[PDB]
Structures are given as C-alpha cells and as structure tokens.
C-alpha cells in the first residue's frame, strides 16, 4: 500500500497490484478469527487498512471487509492479555451489535445482501460516499 | 315549555332520517345543521344539558366542511360517526325504530330499480351504523339479517349477498358484536 | 415528578381553556386517574367505609329517601324531607372530606403539588379550582357513585342509597367546580348550601396542593415497544440507541 504511490491511478481497482492486495486481504479475512493475528500489538496498523479499503471492489471483498471488522472487535473483546475493565468490555459488546446493524451494511456497501458470511465464502459497483467513511472512522475512533 | 323541546326532538328525528338520504347535498346540509342545535343548547344554559352527543356533533361539524366527493366516502364517514355517538338519545332511539319499521316494508317491496337498491343498501348502512343500544326490536333486525344473507332464490340475488357481506362485514357497532356471535352460534 | 411534569406541561399547552382542562379521556387524564387510584385507594376506602356503614346499617330502615326530583318523586314521599336528609348527609361527608386533610398520603400530595405548579405555570389565577375539580371528577365521586365497584363496600347498596350517591356526585362536583346549578331546575334549592361550601372545599384544596411502593412486576414492555416500533424512529442519538437495544435482545 505504501508502494502504490509510485505509479498512481485514481480508482485503485485500476492499479497494477490491486489483485495482490485483494488476494492478501483474503488472508486477513481467513486468519482473523480467534486473535490469530495479534490485535494487542497490531491494532493501529490494522484499522488503517480497514479505513483504506472499505467499499472497494466486488461484493465478496466488500462483505469480507465487514466480516474482518466484526472479527477484529470480537477478538479484541475475547483477548485475555489486555485484561480490560468491565465498562470497556460493555461498550465493545454494544459496538458489536452496532456494527451488526443494517445501517452499517449500507455504510460498508452491502445493501442487497442479507448475510455477509454467506456471500463472503461463496467462491457495476455502487459509488462511494465519503461521509460514510467519516462515520465509520468516528466509530472506530470511539472504540479505540 | 316542554313542547318546544318535543318539537326539537322531532327535528332531531328528521335530521337523523335525512342522514341516509340518496342525495349527497341533503346529507351534507343535515350534517352541517347540527351547529345551530349545539349553540342554542349552549345558550339555553354544560354538556349534560344537551343529550350527550355534543362532542360527536362537534365531530359532525368538523367533518361537515372538509370535503365533497362521491357518495361512498361520505357514507363511510356517516357510518363512522354514527358508530361513534355511543349514547341513547330518545331521538336516536326513535330514529332507528321508525327506519327499522320502514325497513321491513322496503326489503319486502325489493323482494316482491337500481336506485331502489341504492337507497336500500343506504338504509342497511344507516341501521347497522347506529349502535341501536338496548340496555327486542334490534334482535328482530338481526335475525332478519341472518335469515337475509342466504337470499337463496331472488332475481337480483347476489347484489344482496355481496353488499351484505360488506356492510355487516365492515360497518357494525363494536358493542353489537356479542349478539351477532350468539346468533351465529345457534344458527 | 419529571414524568408528570412533562405530560402535564404537554396537556396544559395542548389545552384551549382552563374550563376544558383534564376533563376528557386523554392519556394525561388517565394517568391522573391511575395515580389517584394507586395512591389513594386505601385512603379513600378508609375515609368512606365507616360512613357508608353508618348509611347502610342503622340508618336505612325508616323509608329514608333522597329523591329530590318532583317528576320521579313517589306520592308517599316528601320532597322537603328528602332534601333535608340529603343536605344532612351531604354536610356530614363534606365535613369528613375537609377533615381528612391530615390523613392524605404524601406521594399523591407531591403529585397534586406538581399538578398545581404546572397549572399555575399557564393559569396563575384560580389554578386551584382546576386542581380540586380533578380530585372530585375522577377520584372521589366515581367511588361515591359505585362503592362496590370501587372495592370500598363488599356488596352493592340499596338503590335509594345509590340515587343519593349519584346526587352526591352531582352536588359535590358543583361544590368543587365553584359553579352553581344552572341546568336542572330541581337541583337549584341546594345552590345556597353549595355556595356556603365553596370556600370550605377551596381551603382543603389549597392545603392538599401545598408541599413508597414496591418494584415493577413481570410486565413485558417489549410487546408494547415493538408492535409500535415502525413509526417511533420516524417521529422527530435516541433512535440509534433504541435500535442497538433492539438488536441486543432477541425477539420472542
């Protein structure tokens, strides 16, 4: 993502290593289950990529980003090394239900699809709204 | 004197019987008429001085000046506010009584022309619109109706039945339901 | 206090005049009646049970009647003695109601104080006549008319007592509203005694309007909230918080 700035194209679905980023993003989706990527040390890097690739590409990757966010918050809740207080665990538990809402389905670009996990594992795009990115970044700021 | 009050009650009978008139403008005028009765009952004096239909007559006044359309929505609002009155005025009692008396003659002459059916279904909607509070001639009308919707052999026929399954289907007093259920049970 | 303050502020801003205030079937009037019931059923039954026991037992043998209408008057009865018995027992229970100020519960006293403050926030002159009438139209006189149905008495009284109690509701409502009889001609001889008890009722009303239960039961507020869920987000982060609390609880 750092080296994409050398030969810039505006879309980022047009850039030469788009398929590379998509392929390795599927790695994070698979690997994001039970704190199998260490969220206790790689959290600010991880939200950066989350912010950078919302609502991008085909429907499967768009749902995969959402499932990545859900699994990130879930493993952040269930991590024992952090040993949070009770109130923080409560607000994370509410935040999971917040991101489960159909409003955030609209924000992440999955409007027609009922279930993210069904379309995420199965194997023309609507335009992006930047204020939706603003709301998502504010929610992740509050969580963080 | 009570004589002017008696003539006032006869006037209320006349307005209630014009409420089912085939001409829409006559029903509109009779609906608009009630404000004069309300203000004269106010200046003879609160709510108990009039027979307690005063707020429903305010509702009559409010619906009277809104909109003029076809006869169906006007009749629907007539059935709504005639359900909504919920009080036993002696003028109201006389109003359902004499219309029920003319009702038997009306359905008899229908049994033995589409304007006649129009005023006929208007009379059914008016009589089922009233609560008819007993607190029995109303039960006589009910047994007539339950004997009526079969309407097995008649020239007009189904235009009875369908209209009936609308009119008792939709337009009936909520306090009139147990009598209908108990009649249906033993039929 | 905040709950009643909000709905009664809404009720007095949606009311046209003081003479039509808390005299319908509105939600604030129903909540008024239920607050009266749950804070004064015990106080009203303790005030009215021995008085009704004196009326039914050891008074009602000697053809005592309160029929003051000459149209419905029996030929064997006297109008003057019916009015005399009615005025005597009216003075007795009105004096008991005025003397029952110290036994009035404090929770409903704070409720009536909040009501007095709300009505004084828009009708600063003679707000107490709006306060007392609400205590007579919805609390005392329905229990007076139907004491068995209010749970005060074990059974229904004889019908002469019931006619006397319906006229009791009419006379006390004329006392509390500070309005004399103007509609029925046979109610007019009591206008002097109602006028003599105007200020006696008003002092008790001003005493009430100046200056403790268990927890909630099994009430499923979910069914009330979710059968009306469609247009509560439309009516205008409360909606977002409501949606999160909806998603956090599985619907049965």
Swiss-Prot record, chain A:
Detected in brain, peripheral nerve, lung, colon and muscle. It comes from the Eukaryota. Ubiquitinated by RNF7/RBX2, leading to its degradation. It is found in: Nucleus; Nucleus, Nucleolus; Cell membrane. Binds phospholipids via its C-terminal CRAL-TRIO domain. Binds primarily glycerophospholipids with monounsaturated C18:1 and/or C16:1 fatty acid moieties and a phosphatidylethanolamine or phosphatidylcholine headgroup. Has lesser affinity for lipids containing phosphatidylserine and phosphatidylinositol. Interacts with HTR6. Interacts with SPRED2. It is linked to Neurofibromatosis 1: A disease characterized by patches of skin pigmentation (cafe-au-lait spots), Lisch nodules of the iris, tumors in the peripheral nervous system and fibromatous skin tumors. Individuals with the disorder have increased susceptibility to the development of benign and malignant tumors. Leukemia, juvenile myelomonocytic: An aggressive pediatric myelodysplastic syndrome/myeloproliferative disorder characterized by malignant transformation in the hematopoietic stem cell compartment with proliferation of differentiated progeny. Patients have splenomegaly, enlarged lymph nodes, rashes, and hemorrhages. This is Neurofibromin. The chain holds residues 2058 to 2213 of 2839 of the full protein.
């Amino acid at each position: 993502i750092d080296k994409t700035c050398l030969s810039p194209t505006p879309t980022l679905e047009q850039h030469l290593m788009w398929d590379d980023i998509a392929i390795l993003a599927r790695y994070m989706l698979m690997l994001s289950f039970n704190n199998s990527l260490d969220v206790a040390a790689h959290l600010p890097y991880l939200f950066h990529v989350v912010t950078f690739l919302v609502a991008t590409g085909p429907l499967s990757l768009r749902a995969s980003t959402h499932g990545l966010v859900i699994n990130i918050i879930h493993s952040l809740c269930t991590c024992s090394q952090l040993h949070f207080s009770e109130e923080t665990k409560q607000v994370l538990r509410l935040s999971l239900t917040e991101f489960s809402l159909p409003k955030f389905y609209l924000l992440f670009g999955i409007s027609k699809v009922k279930s993210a996990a069904v379309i995420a594992f199965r194997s023309e795009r609507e335009t992006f709204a930047l204020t939706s990115l603003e709301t998502v970044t504010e929610a992740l700021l509050e969580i963080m | 004197p009570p004589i002017c009050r008696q003539a006032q009650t006869k006037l209320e009978v006349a307005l209630y019987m014009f409420l089912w008139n085939p001409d829409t403008e006559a029903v509109l005028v009779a609906m608009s008429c009630f404000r004069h009765l309300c203000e004269e009952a106010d200046i003879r004096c609160s709510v108990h001085n009039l027979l307690p239909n005063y707020n429903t007559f305010m509702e009559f006044a409010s619906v009277s000046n809104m909109m003029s359309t076809g006869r169906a929505a006007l009749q629907k609002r007539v059935m709504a506010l005639l359900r909504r009155i919920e009080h036993p005025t002696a003028g109201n009692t006389e109003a359902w009584e004499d219309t029920h008396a003319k009702w038997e003659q009306a359905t008899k002459l229908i049994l033995n022309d589409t304007d006649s059916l129009q005023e006929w279904i208007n009379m059914t909607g008016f009589l089922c619109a009233l609560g008819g509070v007993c607190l029995t001639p109303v039960s006589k009308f009910m047994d007539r109706l339950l004997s009526l919707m079969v309407c097995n052999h008649e020239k007009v026929g189904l235009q009875i039945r369908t209209n009936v399954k609308d009119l008792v289907g939709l337009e009936l007093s909520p306090a009139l339901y147990p009598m209908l259920f108990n009649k249906l049970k033993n039929t | 206090y905040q709950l009643l303050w909000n709905m009664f502020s809404k009720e007095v801003e949606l009311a046209d005049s003081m003479q039509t205030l808390f005299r319908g079937n509105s939600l604030a009037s129903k909540i008024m009646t239920f607050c009266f019931k749950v804070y004064g059923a015990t106080y009203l039954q303790k005030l009215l049970d021995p008085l009704l026991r004196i009326v039914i037992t050891s008074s009602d043998w000697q053809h005592v009647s309160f029929e003051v209408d000459p149209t419905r008057l029996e030929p064997s009865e006297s109008l003057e003695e019916n009015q005399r018995n009615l005025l005597q027992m009216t003075e007795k229970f009105f004096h008991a109601i005025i003397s029952s100020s110290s036994e009035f519960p404090p929770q409903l006293r704070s409720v009536c104080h909040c009501l007095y403050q709300v009505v004084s926030q828009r009708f600063p002159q003679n707000s107490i006549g709006a306060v007392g009438s609400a205590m007579f139209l919805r609390f005392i006189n329905p229990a007076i008319v139907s004491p068995y149905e209010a749970g005060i008495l074990d059974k229904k009284p004889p019908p002469r007592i019931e006619r006397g109690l319906k006229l009791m509701s009419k006379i006390l409502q004329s006392i509390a509203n500070h309005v004399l009889f103007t509609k029925e001609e046979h109610m007019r001889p009591f206008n002097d005694f109602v006028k003599s008890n105007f200020d006696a009722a008003r002092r008790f009303f001003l005493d009430i309007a100046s200056d403790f239960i268990s927890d909630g039961n099994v009430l499923a507020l979910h069914r009330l909230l979710w059968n009306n869920q469609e247009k509560i987000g439309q009516y205008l982060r409360p909606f977002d918080k409501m949606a999160t609390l909806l998603a956090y609880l599985g619907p049965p």
